[PDB]
């Protein structure tokens, strides 16, 4: 994929829990089971300063993810097809949707 102009100046959101995944199909859904090892338990993303939603964020913060993997992992051995990616764009959501959090509820606390 792409990204304007080059990567944002993005950071890694740690490695988290691996969530399970509900598509609401059989397909869908049973190709995230049969490949939920190839899936990260990370996302990246920018911080809360740049904007300060949770869609804008989930959105740019999975449009990243899903590159960094597809962009650097990829040269490292990965196959990551396009089928699979549509997974990993809801996979990693209710990652980056919990990371939001992870880092607003982290600076609030102590105020930047």
């Not at 100046?9 to 399970?20: D, E, W």
């Not at 990243?64 to 962009?71: D, G, L, P, R």
């Amino acid at each position: 994929g792409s990204v304007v102009g080059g990567l944002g100046g993005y950071m890694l959101g740690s490695a988290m829990s691996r969530p399970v995944m509900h598509f609401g199909n059989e397909y869908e859904d049973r190709y995230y089971r049969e490949n939920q090892y190839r899936y990260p338990n990370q996302v990246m993303y920018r911080p809360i300063d740049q904007y300060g939603s949770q869609n804008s964020f989930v959105h740019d913060c999975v449009n990243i993810t899903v590159k960094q993997h597809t962009t650097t992992t990829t040269t490292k051995g990965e196959n990551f097809t396009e089928t699979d990616i549509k997974i990993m764009e809801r996979v990693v959501e209710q990652m980056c949707i919990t990371q939001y959090q992870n880092e607003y509820q982290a600076a609030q606390r102590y105020y930047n």
